[PDB]
Design a protein around this ligand. Structure first.
Ligand code: SLB
Ligand code: SLB
Ligand code: NAG
Ligand code: NAG
Ligand code: NAG
Ligand code: NAG
Ligand code: NAG
Ligand code: CA
Ligand code: CA
Lengths: 449, 446
């Protein structure tokens, strides 16, 4: 009942779970979906949905949030944001369960969207955008998107303060949290953000001519160099949003009793980051990572190493997991290998699981959508730079998915590793999308070699 | 003031759809699920369910009803009944859709259960039982189960009258509507009913020793006759309800502005009917049928021809569709071939579809649970006495199902035949049971 993970988990949260230098990475694999957790509420109505999940867990507690629609699941409809603070516990038999300490349903008149959450010492910090217009309409409006920093504390109270986006995002026409969780580092909470830049603004101008090409493993693009460069450059300005540059950014905010205190926006050079997209900032062991959704031409899961310098951050060449692809519209489908202009893909994050002894990330766990173009066929597996382990299908090849966010941990008492995969899924005819949490133990076949 | 279906369906409701004496019956088959109709409301909550569907459609309108549970789907928790009146329509494109014109959610303190609906000239008639105890407790309770006759009129108003069960069901310890739809015939509404009889009552005395054995096509039971007869006789008094005779019956009520007017309960002899169970009264063309759920040892889908005369009914030797089996617990599983005592099975009705020129029925459409023992794998198809056509699986093999009820009709304009299949189904990670309407066109390999 204590407001902290039960003793069995103490010391098994947020660290490098598996450190192997010999044993092959893909030798580890997910077992069957165990104890179907019930900490995530079902939709309030039978005709509504729960969508856009965000999750983050510290050494003492976890934070979770999702958006609820009462009728249908159309983005152009009123919504309510559900937010919860909880901890990991075990029953007398050892059964793992996520216990909620506090939760709140923000049912006011504000229209919060694309919210990300982070577990901080003060509770559960949330970054949301507040809008009344459509996304395409947002990028059409020169002014930035309103954003707010909120927090559900251990005392159950929720507080929030709107950020001064006029100045904070002066060079932006649209800006949203990346949905994936944020991370607490050196007294500040760090959230991945993305949106569009005001053409010719100081921020835009500094990105002119900047781009980067990430190639697939053992599958080079046939297009001529001059062509790829031309297309790579154009990937930052897709036709979907009228040519505005879609930019990746990182927002850090001081964690204290004053919400929204001293926000600082960092915009990495596009010679490192690809087109802006939904994302997540996470800390595993002593390393920090920024996951970026493959909304552009690059299909394999990206994990940009992230370093912190006071109130700002720096991203380095990303880790890539070639087999951990995502579905997308042509010419940016899962098998794509050439630079192109598109706004597709889906959020399916990879969680750092296996590392070398020198702390270099080697393998990750995640629930990919095993499909070429359509958003369907969710499947959990362990991935390394080029391969995929034995998989565990979430349901059927028909199952539709919109988001999957995974976080792994260890039960020190039994020394077993588990991975939680939260997925917004739906069946061809069982209603709208709804968020479902799944747990799997990470196994290792020894009778193999 | 029946709103009437669009002129495209006129003459295409409640008639013999396919008349053929040459073509192999199973040469006709369902196409892919043409559409996902929206006329059936989803559960009110994300953690609740909608269950026990009933449907019936007459020449001018259709009637539909289902039970709603707020939390979970435990057949015990408090529940409200949803009832609707609507009509068939088509968009300019010719897209078929069911339009609900009137509906009501009965949310009072009374627990209506196992309700059946019927489309009458005055609207939508509903027969329900009202209970304050489990089924087991009811059967152990000497007094009859309360029942009411209600109606949702074209004007949107709902009126209901409790029947005098103390007299009407004096020989019964428990009684419920068959869930399947009822039918309007000769000025009255007819509902299949089932329950248990009071031992030694007049109704029970007349059934004493009566039984009937229906055999599976080319799958003869090896048991010695003496043994088969003894098992058949005991199948009417299964252990599940303490040896009470589970009886099949039919209740007809005069359709008028006065609900529950002049009720008459017919109890067919058990030399014709098997153990009482859920069922439906259907009318196709000038013929009437009683579908009886295979809750006993007989697996193939049953359709007892039904004729009526002055408030009472008479059932005859049934049509049986050997490939249209249903899952059941052993020893009464889908493949069972011998008389046995059990209370299992599931409601999956067959709709009369293909007839001979002489009006004898030869083929039906239905969504069976393509399983041996577990209630899983709903699949639609056309069936004749021995075979099954190409099928159209509803979802996955692991999909659970609790009821399927089908009704077919024709779009006279395009002369195409379609079948509506309503099914209560659920899939592992997507929540409790939910009733979903499916529509398929009937095609032919010729
Ligand atoms: C603020 C916003 O509109 N978020 C939406 C994003 C963006 O439209 C997309 O990232 C722009 O490229 O797409 C989704 O994640 C998606 O496709 O499932 C739904 C989400 O609600
Ligand atoms: C009145 C009643 O209890 N009806 C119930 C029937 C009866 O139990 C059975 O037909 C006769 O005993 O079983 C179900 O169809 C079932 O299999 O789940 C549920 C339904 O609610
Ligand atoms: C297996 C592996 O990763 N080897 C790398 C090598 O590719 C890289 O060139 C070198 C320099 O950093 O570091 C390691 O040796
Ligand atoms: C194959 C076939 O239909 N044979 C029919 C039979 O079904 C029917 O009962 C009988 C009437 O006496 O006439 C024929 O024998
Ligand atoms: C579908 C089927 O099996 N039909 C056969 C039939 O061809 C055969 O003439 C008869 C002999 O008794 O046995 C039936 O079972
Ligand atoms: C860790 O060891 C691997 C072994 O190949 C090597 O590739 C990698 O560069 C090393 N990383 C560090 C930080 O030493
Ligand atoms: C219709 O024809 C079939 C087959 O010829 C026959 O078995 C059946 O008895 C006929 N029905 C009537 C009412 O004559
Ligand atoms: Ca704007
Ligand atoms: Ca009783």
């Amino acid at each position: 009942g204590a407001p902290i993970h039960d003793p069995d988990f103490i010391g098994g949260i947020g660290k490098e779970l598996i450190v192997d230098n010999a044993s092959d990475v893909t030798s580890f694999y997910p077992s069957a979906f165990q104890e179907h957790l019930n900490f995530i509420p079902a939709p309030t109505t039978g005709s509504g949905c729960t969508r856009i999940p965000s999750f983050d867990m510290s050494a003492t507690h976890y934070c979770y949030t999702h958006n609820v629609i009462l009728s249908g699941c159309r983005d152009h409809s009123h919504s309510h944001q559900y937010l919860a603070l909880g901890v990991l516990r075990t029953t007398a038999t050892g059964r793992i369960f996520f216990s909620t300490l506090r939760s709140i349903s923000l049912d006011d008149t504000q229209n919060r969207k694309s919210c990300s959450v982070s577990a901080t010492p003060l509770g559960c910090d949330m970054l949301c955008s507040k809008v009344t217009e459509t996304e395409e309409e947002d990028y059409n409006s020169a002014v930035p998107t309103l954003m707010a920093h909120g927090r559900l504390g251990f005392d159950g109270q929720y507080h929030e303060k709107d950020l001064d986006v006029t100045t904070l995002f002066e060079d932006w026409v649209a800006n949203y949290p990346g949905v994936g969780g944020g991370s607490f580092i050196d007294g500040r909470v760090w959230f991945s953000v993305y949106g569009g830049l005001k053409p010719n603004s100081p921020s835009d101008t500094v990105q002119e001519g900047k781009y980067v090409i990430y190639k697939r493993y053992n599958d080079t693009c046939p297009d001529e160099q001059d062509y790829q460069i031309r297309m790579a450059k154009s990937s930052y300005k897709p036709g979907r949003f009228g040519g505005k540059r879609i930019q990746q950014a990182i927002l850090s905010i001081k964690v204290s009793t004053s919400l929204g205190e001293d926000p600082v926006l960092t915009v990495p050079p596009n010679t490192v980051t690809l087109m802006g997209a939904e994302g997540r900032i996470l800390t595993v062991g002593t390393s920090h990572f920024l996951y970026q959704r493959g909304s552009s031409y690059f299909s394999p899961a990206l994990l940009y190493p992230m370093t912190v310098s006071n109130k700002t951050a720096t991203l380095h060449s990303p880790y890539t997991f070639n087999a951990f692809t995502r579905p997308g519209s042509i010419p940016c489908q899962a098998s794509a290998r050439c630079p192109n202009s598109c706004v597709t893909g889906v959020y399916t994050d990879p969680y750092p699981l296996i590392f070398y002894r020198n702390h270099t990330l080697r393998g990750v766990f995640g629930t990919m959508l095993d499909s070429e173009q359509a958003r369907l066929n969710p499947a959990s597996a362990v991935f390394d730079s080029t391969s995929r382990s034995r998989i565990t299908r979430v349901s059927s090849s028909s199952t539709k998915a919109a988001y999957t966010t995974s976080t792994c941990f260890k039960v020190v008492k039994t020394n077993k590793t588990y991975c939680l995969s939260i997925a917004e899924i739906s069946n061809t005819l069982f209603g709208e999308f709804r968020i479902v949490p799944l747990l799997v133990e990470i196994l290792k076949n020894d009778g193999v070699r």
